[PDB]
Amino acid sequence: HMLEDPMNKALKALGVLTTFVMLIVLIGGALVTKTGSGQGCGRQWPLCHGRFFPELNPASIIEWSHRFASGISIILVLSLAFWSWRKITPIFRETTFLAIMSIIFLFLQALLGALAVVFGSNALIMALHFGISLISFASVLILTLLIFEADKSVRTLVKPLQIGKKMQFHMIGILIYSYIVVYTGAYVRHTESSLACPNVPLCSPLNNGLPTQFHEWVQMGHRAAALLLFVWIIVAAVHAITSYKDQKQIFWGWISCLIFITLQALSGIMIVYSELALGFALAHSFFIACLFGVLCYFLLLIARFRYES
């Protein structure tokens, strides 16, 4: 392919690896405790540090793989930030903002996680961790995207597209609102309001399906917030399908967003129905990661378009 130094494809490999590790750090948190002394332990059995005799269980692998990914992340992120900064910035000026964003948020989530060991009873603060971890991942994801695009003459995704004002409203607006919905979700978790409402879409058989207790209000607020996001994405997708059919990145970008929002909602309903089976929990952290990634991709398009035009 390219007669340049073979070490370059190693920067692409590092990008893929780190993006993957950062995704693991994020969605893996759906399987282990993030607060208290049992932090790092499978959520279903907070005791994994100390007393137990047995070893090599499938739940022990999860706990080892998460702590491993979290430790190795500092090494990987710093290396990717530096190397890509040194090599990719000449072509993409955005490279530096991303490298920096990657480092800052990796540290922010590590800082918040450290504090969660002892201040995990503050749900309002604890509910900030996911969104931070999410941006840590999205920063590395987009940086990796630029690393690949830097090595192509006909770029696949990072193309200078014409983004109209309305589409820009939807893109940026949905990006920001999705982050808010992400907070309400994290707030349900850390506030233990996950199973307050056995039914869907409404709360329960009693009180006409309306919340009448703390945990039911948190649960319901999350679902309500999610519904609005869902509807907005449908409106945004329809505008893309109608007015951006000639700009396939935007056309398909939103279709995939539509699909991720659907899978997010479905896995959310399944968390409830299954009474928080971690497999659905894991799915619920993963699809929002995909959707947010696409929204951050869109933000890069706008950032570049606003610089160009």
Ligand code: HEM
């Ligand atoms: C479609 C838009 C939705 C988005 C973007 C979204 C996002 C999130 C996020 C970011 C969390 C935090 C996860 C964590 O901290 O581990 C969460 C948790 C949760 N979500 Fe959603 N959610 C959506 C829809 C739903 C729906 C429709 C339901 C259910 C009817 C739902 C039920 C839950 C529950 C029960 C939790 C807490 C799970 C736990 O304790 O780990 N979500 N959501």
Ligand SMILES: [Cu+2]
């Ligand atoms: Cu309670």
